[PDB]
């Protein structure tokens with residue numbers, strides 16, 4: 085299968101990237117180095133993950149080694165919720181750039197639609213545990229993202245965890261200058277996202293599937309459904325002489341999605357890349373879709389009253 089998808093900014097995005105949430109800072113430099121050595125050309129990052137400096141060390145070393153050229157990499161990061169303010173967006177982007185050892189990002193996303201009170205804390209709470217909102221809306225935040233394109237800091241801008249109506253808000257913005265290139269959302273067989281995907285794809289927005297393996301290392305896991313252990317998925321894998329993870333990665337690829345599995349295990353980083361030499365049948369695809377149960381890895385009770393919280 086073709087390795088890249090065309091975005092609505094004219095650039096091409098690798099359909100398979102390496103996730104970095106939860107990758108320990110003492111492991112992620114090697115993980116990214118290994119990933120680039122074995123063929124990854126897309127790394128998914130975020131300031132809130134607290135490991136961009138270490139991701140950047142890997143990127144810079146592989147550029148310096150001339151393993152890759154900068155033009156061949158596709159580096160994604162995300163604006164955290166406490167930086168939804170006109171006067172904070174550029175500096176947030178620049179901190180990410182400085183940490184990643186880059187002079188531009190290929191794609192910069194609004195990480196969540198909700199803005200929070202600025203300050204040192206990533207989740208400022210009131211004394212009853214509710215997140216403290218910012219008054220700044222997604223349209224004004226989008227305008228600030230557009231400025232980053234116009235300043236050369238980012239080649240593409242997009243959104244993440246935006247629901248149907250929030251995507252529509254963005255698309256209907258008065259004076260919209262750049263459409264979102266991508267909406268990055270949770271997507272896997274237990275949360276198949278058909279409705280949001282069809283909306284987004286119909287508008288030309290590329291969808292990236294996060295937590296494609298069901299985020300088994302998520303910190304709030306309970307002893308919960310498990311994609312990797314689901315014998316029905318294991319059976320499809322066995323039929324194709326592939327691992328369950330490889331099936332879970334190939335699945336979104338055949339839906340015209342980008343997918344960003346995370347690993348810090350070198351053998352798995354390599355395993356997860358070996359997904360371009362087999363095809364799931366239409367029956368396999370429909371069977372995997374049938375496992376939907378509307379189950380989310382990423383949700384957060386403290387944020388559910390924010391006006392712009394995306395999920396119900």
Ligand SMILES: NC(=O)C1=CN([C@@H]2O[C@H](COP(=O)(O)OP(=O)(O)OC[C@H]3O[C@@H](n4cnc5c(N)ncnc54)[C@H](OP(=O)(O)O)[C@@H]3O)[C@@H](O)[C@H]2O)C=CC1
Pocket residue numbers: 102103104105106128129195244245268269293294295296297298299300301302312327329330344345346347348349352353355356381382
């Ligand atoms: N925009 C957003 O709001 C969000 C974005 N994301 C992005 O998506 C990425 C992927 O999602 P994430 O939630 O991390 O979870 P994933 O679904 O990618 O699962 C990661 C887990 O699966 C394990 N694993 C990886 N490969 C294999 C394999 N071949 N066999 C068995 N186990 C395997 C990893 O273990 P190990 O590392 O020990 O090998 C880790 O515990 C994130 O890292 C982040 O970049 C995720 C959530 C939210």
Ligand SMILES: O=C(O)COc1cc(F)ccc1C(=S)NCc1ccc(Br)cc1F
Pocket residue numbers: 105130132133134196197198382383384387393
């Ligand atoms: O968010 C990620 O990329 C991965 O997850 C995280 C990664 C981090 F580095 C810190 C917190 C999260 C959490 S708790 N994320 C869920 C979450 C955050 C904000 C809102 Br609005 C809703 C929500 F569901």
